[PDB]
Amino acid sequence: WISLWKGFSFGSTRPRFLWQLKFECHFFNGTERVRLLERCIYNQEESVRFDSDVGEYRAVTELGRPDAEYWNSQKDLLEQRRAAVDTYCRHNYGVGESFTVQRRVEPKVTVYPSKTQPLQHHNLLVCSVSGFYPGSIEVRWFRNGQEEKAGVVSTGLIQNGDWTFQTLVMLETVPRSGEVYTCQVEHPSVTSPLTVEWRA
Amino acid sequence: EHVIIQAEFYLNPDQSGEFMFDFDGDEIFHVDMAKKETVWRLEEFGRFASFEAQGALANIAVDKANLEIMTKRSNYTPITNVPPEVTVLTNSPVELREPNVLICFIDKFTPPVVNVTWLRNGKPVTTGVSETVFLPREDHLFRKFHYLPFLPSTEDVYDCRVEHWGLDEPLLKHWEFDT
Ligand SMILES: *[C@@H]1O[C@H](CO)[C@@H](O)[C@H](O)[C@H]1NC(C)=O
């Protein structure tokens, strides 16, 4: 696992000053197309950047102009950066392909009634899906075997920060006694979509 | 499509720095400055790979240098505080007497220095908690998580108290079992 090195800039109740840089590796169709993007962010504004597509350092604001001229003068730095797509971006991908790119965690589905307003008749139905990875997921609501696509309000993809996601897909309905509702979840972790039912 | 980000920062005059790797918005690991060692987000990752924390500490020293260079160039322009946007949610459906986790999602704030204290009932809570270091964002703000494993009960109420220089009063987010 490699970390990319960095040179120096040009020059030399309390207030706060923030500086940060980010090395972004972008993978398209797997390793086929890789793109490296370095950013230098003083406070909240980006000032200078290096794009693998352009191959040079370019300034984003007035602050980044000295660094762009300075760092482009260093030929060894540019020749090292242009080749960093393979030596750095592609390297870490191979190191982390097994447990991140090829990581699959099965979701846990629960269905339980709820009330959108204190109407006290449990008009709303909740399908709770939590603990899954990756985020790509499809949750559908079925009433008596028929797909219900109108009146479905949901929560977006929620990130728990522990490499697991959660989401809620809700159905506003009038629960007639004797009807069966089905929540169907389709996820890369499972070959067959999970189904959970709730009987009035 | 996937994105691996190597994000580091340095902040003055607090002299607070951080080094971490982010994958699709989830932290892979961060380097602990005080203990000078690598801290993996999940322990399972440590068996498959490794990382030399010395190379991380070398970049941080440069960040301090470039921050001092960029500050003078900018005519000592200070940063504009951005108040966070807190959200408290549970880790799973809430059943009485069933162990669960509480999450406090701090987001959209800068600079990356906040102080978070859990406030169950009216009494603070210090046990069982964990957190994550500041995670990077596209707009260059920050993200943070604070957890609290607890035991649900009808008569227990929780609060997440967040302190940030962009706020006039500490933001209080509440959670209680409603049924
Ligand atoms: C914790 O955060 C608060 C928020 O402004 C700040 O006043 C304080 O200096 C921070 N550090 C502490 C309490 O050590």
CA dihedral A92, A96, A100, A104 (to 10 degrees): 150
Contact of B102 with chain A, judged by CB distance below 8 Å, is answered with no
Hunting for tokens 């982390």 — which residue is that? Answer: A96
User: What atom of ligand 1 comes closest to residue B165's alpha carbon?
Assistant: 5
- Count each helix (H run) and each strand (E run) in chain B, helices first: 2, 13
Bridge partners of A166, per DSSP, are: A130, A158
From 3.10.320.10, 3.30.70.20, 3.40.50.720, 3.40.190.80, which CATH number describes the A1-101 domain?
3.10.320.10
Q: Which residues contact B164 (CB under 8 A, 6 or more apart)?
A: B81, B83, B84, B109, B113, B114, B171
Largest Cα–Cα distance in chain A? 77
The span from the CA of A45 to the CA of A42, in Å, is 6
User: What atom of ligand 1 comes closest to residue B114's alpha carbon?
Assistant: 2
The span from the CA of B137 to the CA of A127, in Å, is 30
Helix ranges (DSSP H) in chain A = 65-73, 75-82, 84, 91-96
The span from the CA of B26 to the CA of B34, in Å, is 23
The span from the CA of B41 to the CA of A100, in Å, is 12
Resolution (A): 3.4
Please report residues of A whose CB lies closer than 8 A to that of B72.
Answer: 11-12
The span from the CA of B137 to the CA of A81, in Å, is 23
What experiment produced this structure? Answer: X-ray
The CATH superfamily assigned to A102-200 is: Immunoglobulins (2.60.40.10)
Fold of B1-78: 3.10.320
Cβ atoms A42, B76 nearer than 8 A: no
Query: Quick one: DSSP state of residue B66?
Result: H
Hunting for tokens 């790797």 — which residue is that? Answer: B21
Contact of A13 with chain B, judged by CB distance below 8 Å, is answered with no
Asked if the Cβ–Cβ distance from B11 to A98 is below 8 Å, we say: no
- What CATH code is assigned to B79-179? 2.60.40.10
Asked if the Cβ–Cβ distance from A27 to B6 is below 8 Å, we say: no
Cβ atoms B167, B83 nearer than 8 A: yes
Q: Counting Cβ atoms within 10 Å, is residue A144 exposed (0-12), middle (13-18) or buried (19+)?
A: exposed
Query: Quick one: DSSP state of residue A98?
Result: I
Structure token pair of residue A101? 């790119």
**Nearest by CB: A27 against B1, B55, B72:** B1
Cβ atoms A197, A182 nearer than 8 A: yes
- So where are chain A's domains? 1-101, 102-200
C-beta neighbour count of A197 within 10 angstroms = 10
Size of interface A-B (CB pairs under 8 A): 178
Atom 10 (ligand 1) nearest CA: B115
Largest Cα–Cα distance in chain B? 58
From first CA to last CA, the distance across chain A in angstroms is 54
CB of B127 shorter than 6 A to ligand 1:
no
Helix (H, G, I), strand (E, B) or coil at A80: helix
- So where are chain B's domains? 1-78, 79-179
